[PDB]
C-alpha cells in the first residue's frame, strides 16, 4: 500500500488564455501542492512553508532551469503533434504526469504519462520498463525514444532512484503538516421537498482525505439508498464530502450518520436535529 507519493503535473497549451499560461508545472507531495513553475513568472517557487525553509537557493535555481527547458520542449512538441494528427490551429494541450510512490513493502512504483487533447499519447512504467504508444502518431515518438535507449535509461533512473530519494527528503521536510490529523466537523441537514425528506450528512474541513461516511436505518446499513459526494478540496488544504439519502418524512428519526476519520479518537454518530 502507498505510504507516500511525489508527482508532478505539466500543462502546456498552444495559445494561452486567462488563467491558463503557456506552461505550468506543479509538484505534489501526498497530494498537497508544494512547488510551482509558471511560464509567466519563469521561476520555480515554493507553495508551502516547509519546503521554503528546508531548500537551499540551488534547489530553486536548478529547477528554474528545468522549467525553462521544458517550456521550450512543449512548444516544439505541440508544434510536432499538430501535423501528426493533421490538425488545424487553435487551442491544443499537452499534459504530462510523472512521479513515484513508496509502497508499504519498500518497493517503488513510478510512471510518466503523456496526453494530448484529452487522450493517451505515450507512457512509461517502472514495471514494464517499455514505452506504450497509444496510436500511430505516438509510435513515431516511441521508435525514436527506443532507438537511442536513452530516454528509457533516464526515465528508469529518475523514477526508481531520484524521485523516491527526493520524496523521502520531502516527507521529512513537512512531516508536521503531512501527518497532521484534523477531524471533520459533521452536521446533518434535512429538507422536505415534495413529500420527500432529504437527509444530508456533511463533513467539513478534515485532513487527510481518507474518511468513512455511512447512513444507518435502525440496525441495518443503508448504503443501498445512499448517494455519496466526492472527497473535494477546500481552499485551506482540508477536504469536504457528504452522504445523502431520501426518506419518508414520518420516519426521520430512524436514520443516523456514522463518520470515521483518523483525526477522531472514536467514530462519531450524528442525526438530523431540526
Amino acid at each position: 500500500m502507498v505510504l507516500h507519493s511525489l508527482h508532478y503535473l505539466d500543462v502546456a497549451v498552444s495559445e494561452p488564455s486567462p488563467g491558463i499560461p503557456q506552461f505550468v508545472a506543479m509538484g505534489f507531495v501526498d497530494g498537497i501542492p508544494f512547488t510551482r513553475y509558471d511560464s509567466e513568472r519563469g521561476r520555480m517557487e515554493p507553495l508551502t512553508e516547509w519546503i521554503k525553509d528546508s531548500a537551499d537557493p540551488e534547489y530553486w535555481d536548478s529547477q528554474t532551469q528545468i522549467g525553462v527547458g521544458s517550456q521550450h520542449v512543449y512548444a516544439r512538441s505541440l508544434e510536432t503533434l499538430r501535423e501528426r494528427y493533421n490538425q488545424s490551429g487553435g487551442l491544443h494541450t499537452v499534459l504530462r504526469v510523472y512521479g513515484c510512490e513508496l509502497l508499504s513493502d519498500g518497493s517503488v512504483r513510478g510512471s510518466e504519462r503523456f496526453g494530448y487533447d484529452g487522450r493517451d499519447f505515450i507512457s512509461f512504467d517502472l514495471e514494464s520498463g517499455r514505452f506504450m504508444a497509444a496510436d500511430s502518431a505516438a509510435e513515431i515518438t516511441r521508435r525514436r525514444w527506443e532507438h537511442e535507449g536513452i530516454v528509457a535509461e533516464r526515465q528508469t533512473n529518475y523514477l526508481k532512484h531520484e524521485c523516491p530519494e527526493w520524496l523521502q527528503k520531502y516527507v521529512g521536510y513537512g512531516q508536521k503538516e503531512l501527518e497532521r490529523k484534523e477531524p471533520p466537523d459533521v452536521h446533518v441537514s434535512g429538507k422536505e421537498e415534495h413529500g420527500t425528506l432529504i437527509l444530508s450528512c456533511h463533513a467539513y474541513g478534515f485532513y487527510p482525505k481518507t474518511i468513512a461516511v455511512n447512513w444507518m436505518k435502525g440496525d441495518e446499513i443503508w448504503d443501498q439508498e445512499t448517494e455519496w459526494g466526492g472527497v473535494v478540496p477546500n481552499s485551506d488544504g482540508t477536504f469536504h464530502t457528504w452522504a445523502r439519502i431520501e426518506a419518508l418524512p414520518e420516519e426521520r428519526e430512524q436514520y443516523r450518520c456514522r463518520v470515521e476519520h483518523p483525526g477522531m479518537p472514536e467514530p462519531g454518530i450524528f442525526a438530523w436535529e431540526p
Binding site: 508532478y8 505539466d10 508545472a25 509538484g27 512547488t35 513553475y37 520555480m44 534547489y59 536548478s62 529547477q63 528545468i66 522549467g67 527547458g69 521544458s70 520542449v73 512543449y74 516544439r76 512538441s77 510536432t80 503533434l81 504530462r96 510523472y98 503523456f114 499519447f121 505515450i122 513515431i140 515518438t141 525514444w145 530516454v151 533516464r154 529518475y158 531520484e162 527526493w166
Partner: peptide, 8 residues
C-alpha cells in the same frame, strides 16, 4: 524535484 520533458 522536476525532471525535464523530452522532445516527442
Amino acid at each position: 524535484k522536476t525532471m525535464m520533458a523530452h522532445d516527442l
